[PDB]
Symmetry: none
Subunit: 520 residues, 2 copies
């Protein structure tokens, strides 16, 4: 198998190589010779075969190598979880750290070798989870030995083990392996025949919408633009059916499709201007399911914690979905991998967050718990911001600023009208959304400017950003709360409508002068 095949391969490669050299030579001395030429050709082909045979054999060498190390790490992981005393536990992790690393290398190898990108993604995703959890399993399984009466800890340890076991299998599964979608799909229509097989590849493969999980506007917009392009496709399939044979150029009918089909591809640009906006219709409030999910457990409340798991979990994955929708549309693979990977890790760091809350809700005094939470908290936010920053790039920074401009405008007035309606519950709420999108805008603008060389362009932009967050925003928040303390205190002190409006306007305008500075 191993060495066996190798020597054998070296042979074929050696022999064919010699015959190729001579042939190549005889051709060099007589390049204007047709025969001597053909000889060189056949020779080249023969060389290819010998060379490839070695590559294939070489692939086995790598695969096998991956297997050996894979099985080693498998047992090691289970041995770590089953550790009973801190002595054995510490001993296992040390003998596993290297084994894990080695496998990590070998994994990256097959990852590249795997042809179809799909499997390649699985390999990297599996490798990641494996790489991240291995250390965590140690910390989890360790806690169970210090507090054997904390089912919460045991449950966590096992969940990590589960994910780890998954990764290992995923590596082997992908090791046996051997893009956008609307882009490549739209490029298919041009022939004087078979209108029956094209009508099926353009019909049954052009019916995949999505929508949902967005605000009412995004649903409406998507509904209108999706119907306008569906009709478009049918105008292309009903008008095209009249070309026949000789119409192999561009007349009134063939172009009746070329003007409808070639232009209506807009649906794509519609779903984008419809998704990228989620970033401000349910984002910045990223801490919302953590800075309370923790406070619950941190207060010895085992009840409002169980119910919060779903609440937390819900807002989380919902965010990842939109991140995926951003992947469906984006021929950018390098960036899709980033997003899809950042999503996987963050998708795997989910159960851990819950386990933490569980162990803390039962022991809001256990310094080990309060620290375990604090630690997990840090890792969750850290993994969130990245997935977020990874996505902010999968899209157009500029487009983001555009949608943020309109939406900001909407919520801004929602507050202004709330100030008039003297509805604090709304005044507060709306104001918050304003602070959200605003900051979400300053972060994306700045994080995107790190790819540009400092200068007039970067200066005029950051300044516009500095103002909105340093001068603007504060004066507005100062007015929001100022209004609140004018109806909940005593009967109801008179609110200064003026300053509130002008202050709030600065917010919107601020975004405007930043967007304008971004373009320039």
């Amino acid at each position: 198998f191993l060495k066996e095949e190798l020597v054998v391969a070296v042979e074929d490669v050696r022999k064919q190589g010699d015959l190729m050299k001579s042939a190549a030579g005889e051709f060099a001395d007589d390049p204007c010779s047709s025969v001597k030429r053909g000889n060189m050709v056949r020779a080249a082909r023969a060389l290819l075969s010998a060379v490839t045979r070695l590559l294939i054999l070489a692939d086995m060498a790598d695969v096998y190598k991956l297997l050996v190390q894979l099985k080693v790490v498998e047992d090691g992981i289970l041995k770590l979880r089953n550790a009973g005393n801190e002595q054995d536990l510490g001993i296992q992790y040390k003998a596993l750290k290297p084994e894990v690393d080695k496998l990590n290398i070998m994994a990256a190898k097959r990852q590249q070798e795997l042809k179809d990108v799909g499997n390649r993604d699985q390999m990297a995703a599996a490798r990641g989870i494996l790489q991240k959890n291995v250390p965590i399993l140690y910390t989890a399984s360790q806690a169970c030995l210090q507090h054997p009466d904390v089912a919460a800890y045991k449950a966590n340890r096992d969940l990590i083990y589960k994910q780890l076991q998954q990764a290992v299998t995923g590596i082997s599964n992908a090791a046996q392996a051997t893009i956008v979608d609307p882009l490549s799909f739209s490029e298919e229509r041009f022939r004087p025949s078979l209108e029956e097989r094209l009508e099926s590849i353009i019909s049954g493969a052009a019916l995949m919408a999505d929508s949902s999980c967005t605000r009412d506007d995004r649903r409406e917009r998507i509904v209108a633009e999706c119907n306008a392009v569906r009709q478009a496709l049918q105008d292309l399939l009903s008008e095209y059916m009249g070309n026949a044979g000789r119409k192999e150029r561009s007349d009134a009918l063939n172009s009746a499709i070329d003007k409808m089909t070639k232009k209506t591809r807009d649906l794509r640009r519609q779903l984008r201007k419809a998704v990228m906006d989620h970033v401000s219709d349910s984002f910045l409030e990223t801490n919302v399911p953590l800075l309370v999910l923790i406070e619950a457990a941190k207060n010895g409340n085992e009840k409002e914690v169980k119910e919060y798991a779903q609440v937390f979990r819900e807002h989380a994955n919902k965010l990842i979905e939109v991140a995926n929708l951003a992947c469906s549309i984006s021929n950018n693979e390098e960036g899709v991998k980033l997003v899809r990977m950042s999503a996987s890790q963050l998708e795997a760091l989910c159960p851990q967050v819950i386990n933490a809350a569980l162990a803390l809700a039962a022991k809001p005094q256990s310094k080990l718990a309060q620290e375990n939470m604090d630690l997990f908290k840090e890792q969750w936010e850290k993994q969130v911001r990245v997935l977020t920053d990874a996505v902010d790039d999968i899209t157009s920074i500029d487009d983001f600023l555009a949608v943020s401009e309109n939406h900001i405008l909407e919520d801004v007035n929602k507050c202004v009208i709330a100030l008039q309606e003297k509805d604090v519950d709304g005044l507060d709420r709306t104001a918050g959304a304003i602070r959200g999108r605003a900051a979400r805008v300053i972060h994306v603008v700045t994080s995107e400017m790190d790819n540009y060389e400092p200068g007039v362009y970067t200066e005029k932009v950051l300044e516009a950003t500095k103002l909105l967050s340093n001068t603007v925003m504060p004066r507005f928040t100062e007015q929001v709360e100022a209004a609140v303390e004018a109806l909940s205190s005593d009967p109801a002190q008179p609110m200064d409508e003026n300053e509130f409006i002008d202050a709030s306007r600065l917010v919107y305008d601020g975004i405007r002068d930043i967007r304008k500075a971004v373009l320039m």
Copy 2:
């Protein structure tokens, strides 16, 4: 470009080869060395690159070569068509015969090189038509010079030229290279939401019948089974509308669809057992529009020839349609291409057949015409049998024998009853249909057995086939005519009812023991 690149390629291949040899060596003396090993690997990869670079360059050499020869044959073909005197004409064909051949070789080269099979098919199809027509163009364009007042000849010559021009382009087009429908449709239903978008993709896309262009039975059968499955779909769309959300398993309602929808897919199997039967309800009589369409023109009858064009043309295309219906249902692409292609060629060889008859009907003595017809006749039948054999495979040989069993039975009795009714016009007619389906059965049975290894199974089958065509059939035909000469001769000689029935029964039985032998 050519030689230029070559010498260059030989270099990279030469240098890399040397470095590879040494590396391979150092590894041989120390195979247990990891470093020396890696070296060998990197070396192997480097060799691959040098080798490939040569292959690519080599591809150009072949492509270019194809181009040169392609342009040569192009002009030659046009020069042949424009020939005015038998002198120049004969001269061109001779200087083209070789040019054509050379290109034929070069074409076969790129054909293999082309990666995607699709283009590969085009290359072969284009090459074929080019190979076949080149000689024909000569015979056609030649006739026009001997009888300049025969538009029929001119029209033919040009059509050949058109096809030839097509092939050439098709070769160059493919040289730049590197599904079913009911099957994929039925696999769509499984989700706790959006019952409004699924109801439209399962309703508006499940309404495409056909029927017609068959005997009364095939229309009735199709009508019954199409209505039984239409109702079925509505039992799936009316019962499904009650799953809601939690019903994500398989209860009484969700399965009320799973038992109706999952079983009624039979409509498909109905349209098949309804189409494959055409093969004996309007086939074998394939010569019928030729062995008379010719006799007409061959008798200097320019009148019954014009009217026969439509008659001939009608029976032809009708046959192709059914061949297409056999394509709609058959996920087999490789076979569909065959059928669809065999149909195209035969669909293009149609106008030519007519042109022949036209030129002969006007000159039933012109040895040039009588030969042109004889030639065209051969090509039409040849292209027919193939399209036919191509289709006989797109279906189930066994199923064909089944339907042939029932239909034979019907026509058989139609004759027996005709013998009793003493209706010769029917006796003759029916008997013919019997001889048709019968032979159509023996050919399909034998042509299908060429895919099986000779032995007991093949023996017991062919014999059953041999009997039906050697012993059976004859004794029956002998009785049919024998009965005819028993009422048209003198007043009406007494017919021997006995022998006629027994003889005719052999026909049916013959088919039975062949079908049974096919199964076994």
